[PDB]
């Protein structure tokens, strides 16, 4: 009957509005996941520019 | 004298990566409430 | 009509829970990105901790 | 009324397929993130290796 | 006599990476069934 | 002589990493514009 299907319609909006919150969070939640991984991305970077200029070098120097 | 080697620093990104990390988790905790009231 | 309605109504409530039950899954996924970005963040920590306490000391201590 | 129901119904099922095809982006982009998180793994195990296959070595052989 | 180097070692840190990312695109398939699903 | 150090190179593997997660926020980006239409 109509009042059953209005029930349904009224609860069904209701979830989807959840959901749209939902999905919200979570795409903040990988926004923010995305900004780790570049900030580790960066200090690996970091790691690697300090061995080739920094720990390379000196190792070559310590035999002299 | 030799020369002296500068310690790496990247204390300051991996800061950052945990605080990322922690509002990652707090987003999908905020997340899950939603899912919850369904 | 009330027929057709009810019927969408019904068939919306199920996508609603298939709905739900994805992001679910999406959530557990990005929580398992969570840990594996920690998990390779303490990594690199203990590769800068290994260049400054052993790698570096030994460098100098070559010299000698 | 079913009117009322109906034209719920149907701005409910609209929404229900933007909701799936949000989900679908929003999966795809973790997926992105997961190979970004194997490919920095990939290159922190270079670092690893690299400390202990090329690094220690010369760095004690600097010593004779 | 001379001061030894102790390799490094965060195997067990990189494996548990490998792991989570393996959990991590298995619930992403779960969650593509769900949605297939409508 | 003495054995020369090869530069550890990790470029590409840092390039991979940057282009997807550029990836990841133009899907999310994409997600966004499906939820606005709701
Ligand atoms: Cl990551
Ligand atoms: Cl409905």
């Known amino acids: ?64 | 004298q030799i020369l002296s080697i500068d310690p790496l620093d990247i204390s300051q990104n991996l800061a950052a990566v945990n605080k990322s990390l922690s509002d990652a988790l707090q987003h999908l905790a905020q997340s899950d409430t939603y899912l919850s009231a369904i």
């Open chain 1, 1 to 64: 009957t109509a009042a059953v299907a209005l029930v349904k319609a009224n609860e069904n909006a209701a979830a989807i509005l959840n959901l749209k919150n939902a999905i919200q969070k979570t795409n903040a939640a990988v926004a923010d996941v995305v900004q780790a991984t570049q900030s580790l991305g960066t200090a690996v970077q970091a790691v690697q520019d300090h061995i080739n200029s920094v720990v390379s070098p000196a190792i070559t120097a310590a035999n002299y």
